[PDB]
Amino acid sequence: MWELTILHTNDVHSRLEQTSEDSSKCVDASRCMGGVARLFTKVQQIRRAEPNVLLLDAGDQYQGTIWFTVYKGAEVAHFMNALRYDAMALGNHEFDNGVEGLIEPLLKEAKFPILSANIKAKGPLASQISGLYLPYKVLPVGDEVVGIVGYTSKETPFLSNPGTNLVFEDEITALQPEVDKLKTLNVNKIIALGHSGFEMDKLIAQKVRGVDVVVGGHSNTFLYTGNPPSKEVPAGKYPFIVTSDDGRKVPVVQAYAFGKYLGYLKIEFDERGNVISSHGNPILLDSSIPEDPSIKADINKWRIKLDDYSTQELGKTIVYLDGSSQSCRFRECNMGNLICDAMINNNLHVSMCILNGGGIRSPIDERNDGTITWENLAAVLPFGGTFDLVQLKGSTLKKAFEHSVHRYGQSTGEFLQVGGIHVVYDLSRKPGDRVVKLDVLCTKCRVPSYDPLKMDEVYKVILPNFLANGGDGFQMIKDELLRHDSGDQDINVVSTYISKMKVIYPAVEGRIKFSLE
Amino acid sequence: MWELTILHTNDVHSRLEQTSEDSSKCVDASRCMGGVARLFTKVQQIRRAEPNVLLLDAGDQYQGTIWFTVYKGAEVAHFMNALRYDAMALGNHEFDNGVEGLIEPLLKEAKFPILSANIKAKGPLASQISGLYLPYKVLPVGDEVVGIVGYTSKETPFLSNPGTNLVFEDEITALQPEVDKLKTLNVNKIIALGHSGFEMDKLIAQKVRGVDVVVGGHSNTFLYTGNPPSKEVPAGKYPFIVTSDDGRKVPVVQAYAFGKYLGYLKIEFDERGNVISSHGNPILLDSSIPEDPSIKADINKWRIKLDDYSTQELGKTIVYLDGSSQSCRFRECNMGNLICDAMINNNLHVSMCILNGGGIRSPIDERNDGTITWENLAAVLPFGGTFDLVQLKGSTLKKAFEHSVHRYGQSTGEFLQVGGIHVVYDLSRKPGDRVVKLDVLCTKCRVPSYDPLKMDEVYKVILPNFLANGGDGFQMIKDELLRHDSGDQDINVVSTYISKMKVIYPAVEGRIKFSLE
Numbered sequence A, B: 001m002w003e004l005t006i007l008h009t010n011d012v013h014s015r016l017e018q019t020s021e022d023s024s025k026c027v028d029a030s031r032c033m034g035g036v037a038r039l040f041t042k043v044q045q046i047r048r049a050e051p052n053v054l055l056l057d058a059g060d061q062y063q064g065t066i067w068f069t070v071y072k073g074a075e076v077a078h079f080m081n082a083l084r085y086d087a088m089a090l091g092n093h094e095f096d097n098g099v100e101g102l103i104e105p106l107l108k109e110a111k112f113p114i115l116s117a118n119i120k121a122k123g124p125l126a127s128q129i130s131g132l133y134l135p136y137k138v139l140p141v142g143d144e145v146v147g148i149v150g151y152t153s154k155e156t157p158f159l160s161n162p163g164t165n166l167v168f169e170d171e172i173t174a175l176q177p178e179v180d181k182l183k184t185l186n187v188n189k190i191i192a193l194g195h196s197g198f199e200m201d202k203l204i205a206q207k208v209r210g211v212d213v214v215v216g217g218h219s220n221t222f223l224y225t226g227n228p229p230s231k232e233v234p235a236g237k238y239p240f241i242v243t244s245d246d247g248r249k250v251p252v253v254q255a256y257a258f259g260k261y262l263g264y265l266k267i268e269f270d271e272r273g274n275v276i277s278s279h280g281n282p283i284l285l286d287s288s289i290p291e292d293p294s295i296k297a298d299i300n301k302w303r304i305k306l307d308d309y310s311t312q313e314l315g316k317t318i319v320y321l322d323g324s325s326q327s328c329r330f331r332e333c334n335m336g337n338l339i340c341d342a343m344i345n346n347n348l349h350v351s352m353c354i355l356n357g358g359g360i361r362s363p364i365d366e367r368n369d370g371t372i373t374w375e376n377l378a379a380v381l382p383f384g385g386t387f388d389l390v391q392l393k394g395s396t397l398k399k400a401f402e403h404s405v406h407r408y409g410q411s412t413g414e415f416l417q418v419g420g421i422h423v424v425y426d427l428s429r430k431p432g433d434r435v436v437k438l439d440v441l442c443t444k445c446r447v448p449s450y451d452p453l454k455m456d457e458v459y460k461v462i463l464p465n466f467l468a469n470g471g472d473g474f475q476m477i478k479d480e481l482l483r484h485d486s487g488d489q490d491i492n493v494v495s496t497y498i499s500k501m502k503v504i505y506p507a508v509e510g511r512i513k514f515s516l517e
């Protein structure tokens, strides 16, 4: 009777300009995808056709490319406003530059509500931040109203830098009272829009009474009903139907990441706000959808300040630097090896390296005459961390390599890329006993060679400060390390190594392997 | 009744200054060995004690260090004359700089006979070279005379550059008539002094009638009776006794190489020149034997011209660069990998490398604050060849890798050191079927990885010109190659790569492996 068209995106990660098929920098414009200008054309095409439409963003617009390194969120605000988003949920990467880095660039400049019900501000901050983000928003859609209630990952204090003032409550505990409040105001059509991952989105649908639809992000999930249009493999059907505890069929959606797909769900409601049915599929923002001229011309104006990073050629590559999550979080990926070889070459003392696959966040292409610029490296290592030195026991590395594949097969970034280590896993074995072989490049030896790792011996390892501090559940490294020394800036390490090598050709050479039985 | 003390050396290879235990450049003088000054002290110590003494050299004084690169044989002559050698046999490395490079520096300036019965000069050369080298020499030792008859490897035309004018006959065919001639002149005490290897030395003793003793070289053989004094493992007892076809016990000797040992054999003869018995052992020229002051002061005068190569620091190494024959001809050695990584880095197109272990002729030490100079690299790659590019079929590389271990276990230089290749051998299998696995770094692929070698596919390989031309029995490469392009000078390739890397740490990382069963 009353149809609503929800449009949505998540984990856009500063991909304001059209990208390549792999979400890295665009070279061949004839086959490029995504970008805010192309997203605007589909959005308007839909707005003309459908009278009741909501554009919503389910978190992580911050951090990803040189755009955010330079504009620090002012670009997210300006272009999201230009596209006319109806609402947005806070994701963990909105806190990467502290609470000040979220407040000044985005919250003050955004012309649309920013939502998160489970973030409670306490102490001195509570007074300034009040009203700049809300737990919900009752938005008028035509003759009707739709309630939108936000949620952010409760893991944000560990994953980002939100500070001691913000308290991140359980998603389901904080959402139910805001939903019950919306229902008491006869707001019967209600959407849960947040950033906690597909598993938490599925629990929110199941447990939170009243929630009619769940838009979400954080897990880069791709759902699709039928034959998909690109290389992304669907995790389930679009929408993913969750039968609630109160027998209600609740649809759950996600639109992959990098602004490559525009999520699209048509929900058909009745008079009492019940969902009769729904259907849709994420729309591939490919070359067939033209970029809007007004937006593309405005992107080109903002691009001028970023071209000082695009000018300097750091080196050259005669191979595809596979810095994708589908390789780096599952197998040995040549980007992981390159970064580990630059890490080891930087300090040289130390021969071993361990790098989390989730820290490698973009590939680099070889087809632009193989050139590598600061802009390419700014997408691979956008966090600006440091490659620190740590002294570790053999049992601590064994425990780390066991953590590296404890929940293998979920696209989790804890999978380790290595240098100076030869590891062999057996996924048939139980979690905590999957490392069958682990040889390491000896230090106390005249001719280095790969000998078995000994539990009672001490080894020096160069790794990101994220891992040294316990990130990605690597609590054993933080607790059991014997020494920790702060290293150089991650981009400056790989940038120096590339200029030293001039031409690079990293390969997948058997540092990580998997056994049959 | 009449005792003769034969003293001898072989494969000295321009080690005029004292060396390290591994025969590379001397750093810690307190534990150094060999050198012409130290060799002179033992030689004179013996000459005082024994009245009937012969110092003889069984070939390969040419090529090995910066001394020969600069002085081109003038140093061999001057210092061999200073030590007062009684005779010398021509080895294949005496022909490395052509016949002119043997004539002018050495043959004309030597004050002792130079011998080789199996080299016959023909055409225009025969007239100039006549008399500058002899097939034999009847030397007066006290009241007696000893005949010395020479022999050079019949493989010299392939191993060196003696030119089309010199003909190299079979050792045994050319020696018998010169021995029979010496016997007709009642020369009953006769020594075979040559350069063909321990196997040919053993056949010369067995087959050539009349030869009482066989001094030799070419195989770097170490013989020793009892507990040896250093890291060299004896191939047999000193002397190695050969029972001849005519029931005569013939002793066979060799004194390792690099002037590290002074070979010493006491032969007790009767009145008719028959060998009653013999005994001895190679003397380790270690720190306990002092270097003669007069000679050391004369070495220091000649060293002044060589110090322009010792000044420039090319790079630095934090690992022992194992460029020894005991590793590089038997297993994967880190010097082989370094050279193959410099070869691949030079041309970069091409990802694979094959380098013969015999072409790596000296290690480099890490204890001199890790510094690497042109003098260090001049000992590893003294031949000044070129690393050429070749297009090869998969079956041609399979045949090459099968040749690499066809006669494994004889310290032959045909063993291949590789880059961009992962090879696994099974020495239990028969010669020609010992390669069980052979993966290669793919070229026609976006992300290089190690995939099985395919017989019908074509691969590009960077290898020394020695191997491209069929050297070390690699006839299949010369015959079956599809393309061959001349590359850069070998020293200039590794010298450039070291300066690019600054600090290097090559390792033994599983490019070559051996299976159990």
Ligand SMILES: Nc1nc(N)c2ncn([C@@H]3O[C@H](COP(=O)(O)CP(=O)(O)O)[C@@H](O)[C@H]3O)c2n1
Pocket (backbone or CB within 6 Å): A011, A060, A092, A093, A159, A218, A219, A220, A356, A357, A358, A359, A383, A385, A412, A413, A414, A464, A466, A472
């Ligand atoms: N090196 C390093 N430094 C950090 N500060 C950092 N923060 C997050 N990551 C990685 O990001 C991965 C998750 O990425 P994702 O699944 O695409 C979700 P989200 O990060 O976009 O919210 C984690 O598993 C970490 O490996 C870090 N990696």
Ligand SMILES: Nc1nc(N)c2ncn([C@@H]3O[C@H](COP(=O)(O)CP(=O)(O)O)[C@@H](O)[C@H]3O)c2n1
Pocket (backbone or CB within 6 Å): B011, B060, B092, B093, B159, B218, B219, B220, B356, B357, B358, B359, B383, B385, B412, B413, B414, B464, B466, B472
């Ligand atoms: N690269 C390259 N270029 C060449 N021109 C050359 N000539 C000889 N060799 C190597 O030297 C090895 C033999 O060395 P050896 O046993 O110590 C006897 P000898 O060479 O001193 O007479 C061979 O097996 C070859 O690999 C070459 N290697």
Ligand SMILES: [Zn+2]
Pocket (backbone or CB within 6 Å): A011, A012, A013, A060, A093, A218
């Ligand atoms: Zn994200």
Ligand SMILES: [Zn+2]
Pocket (backbone or CB within 6 Å): A060, A091, A092, A093, A195, A217, A218, A219
């Ligand atoms: Zn996230």
Ligand SMILES: [Zn+2]
Pocket (backbone or CB within 6 Å): B011, B012, B013, B060, B093, B218
């Ligand atoms: Zn030799």
Ligand SMILES: [Zn+2]
Pocket (backbone or CB within 6 Å): B060, B091, B092, B093, B195, B217, B218, B219
């Ligand atoms: Zn020789």
